[PDB]
Amino acid sequence: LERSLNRVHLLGRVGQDPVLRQVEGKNPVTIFSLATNEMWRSDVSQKTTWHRISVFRPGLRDVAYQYVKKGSRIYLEGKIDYGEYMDKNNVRRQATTIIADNIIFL
Amino acid sequence: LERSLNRVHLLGRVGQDPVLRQVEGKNPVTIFSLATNEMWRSKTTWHRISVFRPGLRDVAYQYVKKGSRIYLEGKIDYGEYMDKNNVRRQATTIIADNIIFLS
Amino acid sequence: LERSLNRVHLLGRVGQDPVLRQVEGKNPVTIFSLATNEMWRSDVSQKTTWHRISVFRPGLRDVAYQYVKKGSRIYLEGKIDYGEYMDKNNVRRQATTIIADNIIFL
Amino acid sequence: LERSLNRVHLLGRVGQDPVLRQVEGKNPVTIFSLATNEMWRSKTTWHRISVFRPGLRDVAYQYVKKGSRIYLEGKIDYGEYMDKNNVRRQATTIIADNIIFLS
Questions:
Q1: Do residues A91 and A85 touch, judged by C-beta distance below 8 A?
Q2: Which residues are recorded as modified (Phosphoserine) (chains B, D)?
């Protein structure tokens, strides 16, 4: 009955060296953060936004983990997943971009 | 200086009828939610949208109604704030483009 | 050694009812055209561009062929293929967007 | 009025060192070609880019050099003209965004 789209194109510099996350015994992730900048025209006034990148999928997890280093420019595509975790009845965010593709610019 | 990309493309159903909010003293924003959802072989994602753009916010107030199918493009903002010495997120996609599927 | 990208996101109204192209005995295509508009800010002055859409792939060819009608709003993704055909030694264009995906907005 | 999308995203190697051209009497454009290519299991596509934008064209003249890897976004223009009572195409992607991969 219906298709939706949740797509994110991000191109920026990696802020830190990636961490292989294997807490307790769940399905593993490669976590890194990407820096995106933004100058405002309303004038050269800027801002820098930090994206928590998560790499699920057996293909890209390992390749992201060994080759992505701090300072690398990366292009990627993924989907916005808000990390909706409960606390005391209600909920709050732990948002990630979950990667489907990275092109390394080198 | 170093060029970046921060683009989200969304297409889904509007979940709520838009609310006119105002950041700080004066800064007009229209806010709604949009559902997108994806299916596995054994999840609805709700996104808050902020249309701060001088004219796009007016149009989206006038014409975005709950359950509408919309296409939009924007940039992600994690909206980090301290509720009480504790970092939190108020993540929003600030919409720049917006193609409305109705008449 | 290297990845490139040739991607096109087009959202617009279909100009004519699609034609199943099977000239002589080649691999079949579903051809339709999409209308994209463009207002210029430099002021409400407009322009309308016509895209020759081509649908290869056994999945989408038939589905594009039966369901896409004149006047339908369609969203699609494809790649720019210039129809480089020779004449008398040199070459000229017959450009198509070759579709990989259509979302019908209904 | 009816909103549309006409967006191309390209990433490839620049094939030629940019030429400063001028449409009609006065309208500055920088033009280069970009190769993208895709591989089948048994093709280079050459695109002409026009940067007409007041400042982006200057930057791209200064800094686009042959063989550079570039990322760009633009809108397709089929450039239809009559050479002699016969319709022809001069297809170009008019670039709006342009993220340069060098220093």
A1: yes
A2: 42
Q: Which two tokens stand for residue B4?
A: 């970046």
Domain span at residue A3 reads: 1-106
| Residue from B8, B71, B77 whose CB has the most chain A CBs within 10 Å, to mutate | B8
CB contacts of D101 in chain A (<8 Å) are 73, 105
Q: How many CB pairs under 8 A join A and C?
A: 4
Residues of B in contact with C11 (CB under 8 A): 71, 99
Contact residues on chain C for D37, CB-CB shorter than 8 A: 4
Question: Based on the number of CB atoms within 10 Å of its own CB, is B85 exposed (0-12), middle (13-18) or buried (19 or more)?
Answer: exposed
Question: Residue holding tokens 């000239």?
Answer: C23
Q: Is the Cβ–Cβ distance between A70 and A14 less than 8 Å?
A: yes
Structure tokens at D41: 């299991």
Sign of CA dihedral C74, C76, C80, C85: negative
Task: Give Cβ neighbours of residue C99 (< 8 Å, ≥ 6 apart).
Answer: C53, C54, C55, C56, C57, C60, C64, C76, C77, C78
Resolution to 1 decimal, in Å?
2.4
Q: Name the experiment that determined this structure.
A: X-ray
> How many domains, in total, are found in chain C?
1
Token pair, residue C88, equals 């008398």
